[PDB]
């Protein structure tokens, strides 16, 4: 159950990608 939270609820790659989405494409 935790391995699921620390995967998103905790990490939230949704943000890391957004920030890493720029320097990645731009």
The span from the CA of 24 to the CA of 6, in Å, is 24
Residue with tokens 């391995």: 3
What residues have CB less than 8 Å from 14, skipping those under 6 apart? 8
Number of domains in the chain: 1
φ, ψ for residue 23 (rounded to 5)? -45, -15
- Domain span at residue 3 reads 1-26
Q: What's the distance, CA 16 to chain centroid?
A: 4
Residue 8 and residue 14 in contact, taking contact as beta carbons nearer than 8 Å: yes
DSSP the chain: -HHHIIIIISS-HHHHHHHHHHHHH-
* Sign (positive or negative) of CA dihedral 16, 17, 18, 20: positive
Residue with tokens 């998103």: 8
Taking Cα atoms as reference points, which of 19, 23, 17 lies closest to residue 8? 17
The span from the CA of 16 to the CA of 12, in Å, is 7
């Amino acid at each position: 159950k935790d391995q699921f939270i620390i995967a998103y609820g905790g990490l939230r790659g949704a943000i890391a990608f957004s920030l890493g989405y720029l320097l990645d494409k731009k």
